[PDB]
RNA sequence: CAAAGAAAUCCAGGUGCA
DNA sequence: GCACCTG
DNA sequence: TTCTTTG
């Protein structure tokens, strides 16, 4: 039933001085060296694997190659993603049992069991504790990526921010007997920070909060102009605009923090009575006026707009922005396009000065985050025709929409994928089931929308490009799962791989084909299932070719068994885009190596 | 002083999947 | 329930 | 880098 070992540090344990009789005495040496290792702690940087080599004697491992099996697991811990696991059997399979000196008295029957127990003891009582002793795992919020930060460096960063917040009077200490609603967490955010409350899990008032949220959204639906969907707005705008489109995307700085609580309170109190009780109005006003958080053994009032991480802040920020929109961003020209997602505005017009006027208007009403502004206005510093907005890239010149992929340089793309689920575990002899979950649709489904696959404003050229890019992601997930099979399942025979990949190619082409038919428009010429299959195969080939030694036989079947010919039925499509990794995808890191 | 342990990743909405 | 996305 | 709780 229990197949997985979690890589996360939370599973660590307090080590004893010695082990009991049924554990072998060899661990006492590592325990002794472990305590001695901490007495030598230096601010100077440390390499964990080097430290373990001073802690765990070679004689524990027997052969130096048996040591490598264990340390490969540690290296995975040092480079883990959120939720990542390994198979427990990795801790005892294929070890050289004849060469482990402290097992030579145990019967051949009982050896693997004992090695699992001692390896687990080392990992849970020495390895993970020594990592946690030196480092703090920071969840970076780019996929499931984790970065390990020296504790001194993390505390120093956190103390800078906390001092700012007190100095600005955003955080004000109250008496320690005031009850807080959660714990303040300062998360690193690309050289900046995100102050959130981690809300205390209170399941008693969750139904009440859902009720209040539903009430606020009914106020919004009933009393405020409901914007068309982003897709409908772009479709109608591109259809009626004949010239060059000009446009701007802007982002509000510190959006929740700059909600003016006195204005929001007045707004809530003016909601009509049939839409919100007097008690519920008073409850919300009291709720957002008295925000109390715990931090480092003290209790603070939060006095900077709405607390990020409180469940009610979401619908209340929307209420505030809808009000701002009614006051300031309504009755705009019929010519123009506008759409707002939370604090992000996308404004376009065929008239450049109207885009300029909108920028001036938005900058008078809000404080803008100027690092996030994107525009093709010629007067601006670095104009560009591709505007990122709501996870898509809108090309103002060609009117084409492409999926936005967030892949910084030297980003390990495996951090995007959740290959292991501790609640739904898969046996080490069921590699097929592991791959089946890895190739399921939902993780990539946001690249399979009407934005990518319509032929209303998108040409076939960009429909095919969107599909190829999505299948590049799928192929990278397949590769990441394959790495997991060989290092954790220890799969020897890979016969079934050809079929899963064939079924996966066909399932994804079939999903794209249906979306293309559903969202067909005037730019549709001819899209064939066969052309989509060929594109999907070429995406896999482009990714598999990054490890041609491992995938040589697989690459060779693809080329000898599958038709890779692409009848685009559109002379504007460029075939060479489908013969190589797109540039955004060409530089992602695919080899994991510990740095700490 | 020594050791041990702790220093808390949350929320709304969306796509959907099956 | 799952696993992605937006802010 | 702090805070408890125990040698
Ligand atoms: N609880 C929570 N709220 C979030 C998260 N991401 C965004 N929000 C909410 C609160 C932010 O104020 C608002 C705008 O999102 P941003 O990502 O633009 O952050 P912010 O505007 O706070 O700061 P900025 O100056 O743009 O870096 O959306 C999140 O991960 N957790
Ligand atoms: Ca913002």
In angstroms, the CA A236 to CA A239 distance is: 5
Coil, helix or strand for A480? helix
In angstroms, the CA A441 to CA A448 distance is: 9
Range of the domain at A207: 202-225+259-289+310-334
Q: Do A159 and A116 reside in the same domain of the chain?
A: no
Q: Do A302 and A264 reside in the same domain of the chain?
A: no
Pocket of ligand 1 (CB under 6 A): A 192, 196, 251-256, 308-309, 342-343, 369
Q: Are A443 and A417 in contact (CB under 8 A)?
A: yes
In the 8-state DSSP scheme, what is residue A419? -
Q: Which residue places its CA closest to the C1' of nucleotide C7?
A: A342
* CA-based torsion, A355, A357, A359, A362: positive or negative: negative
Q: How far is the CA of A417 from the C1' of D6 (A)?
A: 44
A255 marked as binding residue: yes
Coil, helix or strand for A106? coil
Closest CA to A314 of A369, A373, A253, A259: A259
Q: Which residue has the tokens 């590049």?
A: A472
Q: How far is the CA of A319 from the C1' of B12 (A)?
A: 12
Nucleotide nearest to A342 (CA to C1'): C7
Q: Are A378 and A244 in contact (CB under 8 A)?
A: no
Q: Which residue has the tokens 């009850």?
A: A179
Q: Which residues sit opposite A588 in a β-bridge?
A: none
Nucleotide nearest to A136 (CA to C1'): B7
Domain boundary among A388, A407, A426: A407
- DSSP string spanning A245-289? -EEEEEEBTTTGGGS-HHHHHHHHHTS-TTTS-HHHHHHHHHHHH
Q: Which ligand is nearest to the CA of A321?
A: 1
* Contact residues for strand B with beta carbon within 7 Å: A 14-15, 35, 38-39, 129, 132, 136, 138-139, 141, 151, 155, 182-183, 185, 187-188, 196-199, 209, 213, 217, 294, 296, 308-311, 313-315, 318, 440-442, 445-446, 448-449
Q: Are A563 and A534 in contact (CB under 8 A)?
A: yes
Q: Which residues contact A41 (CB under 8 A, 6 or more apart)?
A: A133, A134
Domain boundary among A407, A440, A461: A407
In angstroms, the CA A254 to CA A371 distance is: 13
Coil, helix or strand for A93? coil
Closest CA to A54 of A33, A72, A35: A33
Q: Do A197 and A101 reside in the same domain of the chain?
A: no
A331 phi/psi in degrees, rounded to 5: 60, 40
A343: Cβ under 7 Å from strand C?
yes
Q: Do A339 and A231 reside in the same domain of the chain?
A: yes
A300: Cβ under 7 Å from strand C?
no
Q: Which atom of ligand 1 is nearest to the CA of A189?
A: 27
Q: How far is the CA of A253 from the C1' of C7 (A)?
A: 12
Strand positions, DSSP E, A264-363: 292-295, 298-302, 337-341, 344-349
In the 8-state DSSP scheme, what is residue A487? I
In the 8-state DSSP scheme, what is residue A166? H
A520 marked as binding residue: no
Domain boundary among A407, A432, A449: A407
Residue A578 sits at the vertex; the CA angle it makes with A572 and A582, to the nearest 5 degrees, is: 105
Q: How far is the CA of A178 from the centre of ligand 1 (A)?
A: 27
Q: Do A298 and A402 reside in the same domain of the chain?
A: no
Mutating to test ligand 1, I would choose from A342, A388, A406 the residue with most ligand atoms within 8 A of its C-beta, which is A342
A84: Cβ under 7 Å from strand C?
no
Q: Do A285 and A207 reside in the same domain of the chain?
A: yes
The nucleotides of chain D lying under 7 Å from a protein CB are 1, 3-4
Strand A386-389 to A392-395 pairing: antiparallel
Q: Do A176 and A321 reside in the same domain of the chain?
A: no
Q: What is the resolution of this structure in A?
A: 2.0
Q: How far is the CA of A257 from the centre of ligand 1 (A)?
A: 9
In angstroms, the CA A13 to CA A15 distance is: 6
Q: Which residue has the tokens 């084909």?
A: A513
A189 marked as binding residue: yes
Q: Do A522 and A568 reside in the same domain of the chain?
A: yes
Q: Are A73 and A90 in contact (CB under 8 A)?
A: yes
How many structural domains comprise chain A?
5
Q: Which ligand is nearest to the CA of A252?
A: 2
Considering only CA atoms, give the Rg of chain A. 29
Coil, helix or strand for A579? helix
Mutating to test ligand 1, I would choose from A187, A191, A194 the residue with most ligand atoms within 8 A of its C-beta, which is A194
Q: Which residues contact A304 (CB under 8 A, 6 or more apart)?
A: A165, A168, A170, A171, A257
Residue A28: exposure state from Cβ atoms within 10 A (0-12, 13-18, ≥19):
middle
Residues 384-403 (A) near nucleic chain C, CB < 7 A? 388-391
Strand A182-189 to A292-295 pairing: parallel
Closest CA to A275 of A212, A208, A207, A210: A212
Q: Which residues contact A580 (CB under 8 A, 6 or more apart)?
A: A542, A586
Nucleotide nearest to A180 (CA to C1'): B8
Q: Do A238 and A386 reside in the same domain of the chain?
A: yes
* CA-based torsion, A439, A443, A445, A446: positive or negative: negative
CA distances (Å), A370 to each of A40, A248, A389, A506, in order? Answer: 47, 12, 15, 44
Closest CA to A46 of A148, A155, A188: A148
In angstroms, the CA A351 to CA A333 distance is: 10
In angstroms, the CA A91 to CA A523 distance is: 57
A184: Cβ under 7 Å from strand C?
no
Q: Do A448 and A497 reside in the same domain of the chain?
A: yes
A254 marked as binding residue: yes
Q: Do A188 and A299 reside in the same domain of the chain?
A: yes
Coil, helix or strand for A391? coil
Collect contacts of A441-449 with beta carbons under 8 A, ≥24 apart: A441/A507, A441/A508, A441/A511, A443/A416, A443/A417, A443/A418, A443/A477, A444/A470, A444/A473, A444/A474, A444/A477, A446/A391, A446/A403, A447/A403, A447/A473, A448/A511, A448/A512, A448/A515, A449/A515
Q: What residue owns the CA closest to ligand 1's atom 13?
A: A255
- Can you read off the two tokens belonging to residue A36? 């001695």
Length of chain A, please? 596
Q: How far is the CA of A63 from the C1' of B14 (A)?
A: 54
Q: Do A161 and A238 reside in the same domain of the chain?
A: no
Work out the angle between the directed axes of helices A529-544 and A460-484 (0-180°, nearest 10).
40
């Amino acid at each position: 039933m229990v197949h997985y070992y979690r890589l996360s540090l939370k599973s660590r344990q307090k080590a004893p001085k010695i082990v009991n009789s049924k554990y072998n005495s060899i661990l006492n040496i590592a325990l002794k060296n472990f305590r001695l290792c901490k007495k030598h702690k230096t601010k100077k940087p440390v390499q964990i694997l080097a430290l373990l080599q001073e802690i765990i004697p070679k004689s524990y491992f027997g052969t130096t190659t048996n040591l490598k099996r264990f340390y490969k697991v540690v290296e995975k811990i040092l480079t883990q993603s959120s939720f990542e696991c390994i198979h427990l059997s990795v801790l005892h399979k294929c070890y050289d049992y004849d060469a482990i000196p402290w097992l030579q008295n145990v019967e051949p029957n009982l050896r693997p069991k004992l090695l699992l127990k001692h390896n687990l003891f080392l990992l849970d009582n020495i390895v993970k504790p020594i990592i946690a002793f030196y480092y703090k795992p920071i969840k970076t919020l780019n996929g499931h990526e984790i970065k390990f930060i020296r504790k001194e460096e993390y505390i120093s960063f956190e103390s800078k921010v906390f001092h700012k917040l007190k100095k600005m009077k955003y955080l004000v200490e109250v008496q320690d007997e005031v009850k807080p609603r959660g714990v303040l967490n300062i998360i690193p955010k690309q050289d900046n920070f995100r102050a959130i409350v981690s809300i205390f899990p209170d399941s008693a008032r969750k139904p009440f909060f859902k009720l209040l949220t539903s009430k606020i959204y009914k106020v919004l639906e009933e009393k405020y102009k409901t914007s068309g969907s982003l897709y409908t707005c772009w479709s109608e705008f591109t259809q009626k605009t004949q010239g060059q489109i000009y446009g701007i995307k802007v982002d509000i700085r510190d959006a929740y923090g700059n909600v003016k609580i006195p204005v929001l309170c007045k707004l809530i109190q003016s909601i009509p009575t049939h839409l919100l009780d007097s008690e519920k109005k008073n409850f919300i006003v009291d709720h957002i006026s008295n925000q109390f958080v715990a931090f480092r053994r003290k209790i603070y009032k939060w006095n900077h707009g709405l607390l990020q991480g409180d469940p009610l802040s979401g619908c209340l920020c929307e209420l505030y922005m809808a009000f701002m929109d009614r006051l300031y961003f309504s009755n705009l020209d019929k010519d123009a396009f506008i759409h707002r997602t939370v604090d992000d505005y996308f404004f376009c017009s065929p008239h450049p000065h109207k885009v300029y006027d909108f920028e001036l208007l938005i900058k008078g009403v809000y404080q803008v985050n100027p690092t996030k502004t994107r525009t093709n206005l010629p007067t601006h510093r670095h104009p560009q025709d591709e505007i990122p907005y709501c996870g898509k890239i809108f090309n103002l010149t060609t009117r084409q929409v492409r999926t936005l992929y967030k892949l910084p340089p030297n980003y390990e793309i495996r951090h995007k994928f959740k290959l292991w689920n501790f609640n739904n575990q898969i046996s080490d002899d069921n590699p097929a089931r592991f791959l089946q979950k890895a190739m399921d649709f939902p993780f990539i489904c946001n690249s399979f929308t009407k934005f990518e696959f319509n032929t209303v404003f998108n040409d076939q050229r960009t429909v095919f490009a969107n599909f190829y890019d999505a299948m590049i992601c799928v192929a990278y997930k397949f590769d990441a799962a394959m790495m997991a099979l060989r290092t954790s399942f220890l799969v020897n025979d890979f016969g079934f791989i050809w079929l899963v990949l064939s079924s996966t190619v066909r399932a994804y082409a079939s999903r794209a084909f249906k979306k293309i038919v559903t969202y067909k428009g005037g730019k549709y010429r001819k899209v064939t299932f066969q052309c989509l299959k060929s594109i999907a195969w070429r995406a896999f080939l482009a990714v598999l070719k990054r490890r041609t030694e491992i995938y040589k036989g697989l690459i060779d079947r693809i080329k000898s068994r599958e038709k890779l010919t692409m009848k685009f039925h559109d002379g504007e499509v460029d075939a060479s885009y489908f013969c190589k990794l797109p540039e955004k995808f060409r530089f992602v890191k695919i080899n994991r190596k510990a740095s700490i």
